[PDB]
Amino acid sequence: AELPTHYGTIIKTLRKYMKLTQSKLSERTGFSQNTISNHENGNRNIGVNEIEIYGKGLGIPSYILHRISDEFKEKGYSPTLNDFGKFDKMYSYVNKAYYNDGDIYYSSYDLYDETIKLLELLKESKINVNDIDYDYVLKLYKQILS
Amino acid sequence: AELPTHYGTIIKTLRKYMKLTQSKLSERTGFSQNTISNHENGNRNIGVNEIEIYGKGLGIPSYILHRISDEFKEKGYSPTLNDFGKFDKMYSYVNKAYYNDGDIYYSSYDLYDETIKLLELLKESKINVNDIDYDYVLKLYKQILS
Amino acid sequence: PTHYGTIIKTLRKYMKLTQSKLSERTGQNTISNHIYGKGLGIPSYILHRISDEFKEKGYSPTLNDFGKFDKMYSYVNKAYYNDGDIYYSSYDLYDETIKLLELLKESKINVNDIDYDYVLKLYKQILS
Amino acid sequence: STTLAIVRLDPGLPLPSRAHDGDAGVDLYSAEDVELAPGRRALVRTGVAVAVPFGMVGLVHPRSGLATRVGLSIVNSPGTIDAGYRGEIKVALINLDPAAPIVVHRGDRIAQLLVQRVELVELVEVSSFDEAGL
Amino acid sequence: STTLAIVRLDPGLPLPSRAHDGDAGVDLYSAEDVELAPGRRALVRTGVAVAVPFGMVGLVHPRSGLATRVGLSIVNSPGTIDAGYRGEIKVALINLDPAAPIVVHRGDRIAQLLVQRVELVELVEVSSFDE
Amino acid sequence: MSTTLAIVRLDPGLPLPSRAHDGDAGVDLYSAEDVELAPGRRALVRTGVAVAVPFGMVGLVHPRSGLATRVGLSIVNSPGTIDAGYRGEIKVALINLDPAAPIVVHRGDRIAQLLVQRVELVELVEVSSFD
DSSP states (O other): OBOOTHHHHHHHHHHHHTTOOHHHHHHHHOOOHHHHHHHHHTSSOOBHHHHHHHHHHHTSOHHHHHHHHHHHHHHSSOHHHHTHHHHHHHHHHHHHHHHHOHHHHTTOSOHHHHHHHHHHHHHHTTOOGGGSOHHHHHHHHHHHHO | OEEOSHHHHHHHHHHHHTTOOHHHHHHHHSOOHHHHHHHHHSSSOEETTHHHHHHHHHTOOHHHHHHHHHHHHHHSSOHHHHTHHHHHHHHHHHHHHHHHOHHHHTTOSOHHHHHHHHHHHHHHTTOOTTTOOHHHHHHHHHHHTO | OOHHHHHHHHHHHHHTOOHHHHHTSOOOTTOSOOOOOSSSSSOHHHHHHHHHHHTTSSSOHHHHTHHHHHHHHHHHHHHHHHOHHHHTTOSOHHHHHHHHHHHHHHTTOOSTTOOHHHHHHHHHHHHO | OOEEEEEESSTTSOOOOOSSSSOOOEEEEOSSOEEEOTTOEEEEEOSEEEOOOTTEEEEEEOOHHHHHHHOEEETTSSEEEOTTOOSOOEEEEEEOOSSOOEEEOTTOEEEEEEEEEOOOOEEEEOSOTTTTOO | OOEEEEEOSOTTSOOOOOSSTTOSOEEEEOSSOEEEOTTOEEEEEOSOEEEOOTTEEEEEEOOHHHHHHHOEEETTSSEEEOTTOOSOOEEEEEEOSSSOOEEEOTTOEEEEEEEEEOOOOEEEEOSSOOO | OOOEEEEEOSOTTSOOOOOSSTTOSEEEEEOSSOEEEOTTOEEEEEOSOEEEOOTTEEEEEEOOTTHHHHHOEEETTSSEEEOTTOOSOOEEEEEEOOSSOOEEEOTTOEEEEEEEEEOOOOEEEEOSSOO
């Protein structure tokens, strides 16, 4: 099995956002600089096996990578990857709500879809994800599960 | 958090019924004669994890401690506490039915309430709990579980 | 419980090993009118299953032809542990084996002269 | 090599058995014929009692076959068998098909019995989890 | 010997408690009065929150009494409490009887909590089973 | 060290089940197909995965609450058992316990979680009566 070439663009963008060198990313995954190098350029395609290993190395769940790759196949690029800091802020709020609140734990379908939906509402409302507190997110999350 | 003083009266009454000195209940719970006396009189209220330790020391499941309490909160006293010898005999049968008979184990709602009902019926037929055997209780016990 | 003697013996006679052959294993020796397992010679599940057919019909057609069974069971097992269609739809592999041997006998087809794929097709059919 | 004592309260039925070595369950059998109409339930005897060792729990599961094919389920799934319980194992069967009745006969496999370890934990109230850990 | 730390969100209900020495679970009370019409369901607060140790799981089983007698089951049985979870424990009740409504009373025991070790297995993808 | 669980992907279009947080009992299973369940209807639903449950252990398929609470989506045989010898596709027997509202399950949706747990492979010893 071999993945499409846009995965290499996903790993490049997410290595640079997580502030890791090729060398640092190597030490974590086990891949040599050369491997990561070609992967990030499109000299080689990332093995289906390997994407799990990259996810653990970056410290990003593999299914996030997959959902970001699905955006590529559809829209030709990825709006989640281009605004990854915003998704990351909201996703940690969404994640904390799920583990601390009973109106969430027992009602969630998909943390990713809910993360994306809270983000879309804040944009409609012209509100930045850094200018709100957890208490505000929770009240808005409860709405979308209700 | 503290339980509302009536647990004091409940433990003292049950400790006396259990033919226990403050020494025996002290050498079992870890509480000093001083703390048991201040619980039993009302000076100190019984913490929520203290009622669990008392139950174990007395040899009574805390659930009965909580349901006797509930009697007080409604009526102003506990018929069950007043007559706890009639109740202890019946409950030991009820307990033996449940753990040893398919018709009871799978059909039972509340061991406490079912012991109440079986007394009412022995009472209203003018029979003594001290007169009857396991087999008579069981027959009647199977009836009330329909 | 004496019915098992026939079973233990018949399994030996079928198993192509002498008394001494099985009489050296897990301890004529201590075999009289002759379950701990005959060195797990056959899973005790089957020995107890053949026993159960004695208490329903006087005999066991399964033991009467253990040759044909052992082949079919091994197939029915492969299908169970490897096919999603079988695993979620099976009711009892022993019974389902007996049913497949039943159908094969009336079609005058031999167990030893058949492949898994054939049996798997039939199997899927009896389960639907 | 842990041991589960079991009494055939009904001798006409087979002894529950482990089909293969790695298999989690042993099939239980109905002692009685029951017809369940769509939606209806019934408490059916299996004609066995078991001695679940202290520190363990017995678990009664529904079996995939009847579940997928005719909608046969257990209301209180999974059935919890306490280590103190010495009476007959019973199974609360419900028919979850909307139209077809289900007819269980004496001797049919109606459940898997699993035996697992359980933590016999003691419940301590804390002010808040923040103070006592996460 | 293991201690499950628990927070009583609802101080009006007693700490749940293992009724008999070897019993596998501890009943959870309803914190609310509910009526379930046939085939209808309800998420019901139990007035507690727990800290399942890392390497264990919370498991919410339905009570055999309510289910046979009255058809009261749990939709997501057995309900998983993850070790990470620190919210109020709730029970997804459902009336699986075709005609009789069920009434739950604040105070009623309406489920039992088990706690078990769980293999926190490492998934590793392979191409084909060589096993 | 930790216990390995080997997993194959009979359908590579789906992402690999993953353990979101360190001590989460289960890993979510995704649906391999689109399905409409009308009220009281059920379906056996492929997930595009096979597993190698270690000997001594058992795969258990639990319902995701939320689907259960909000649309009454359950599992007929809950909790579904994977034996250590099984190597075929995990399929989930889903059912609609809501009486009015059809349920639509999209390929790629999270329809169940897989726990692995140790199981006592007990020896049955028949006896006359007890001790």
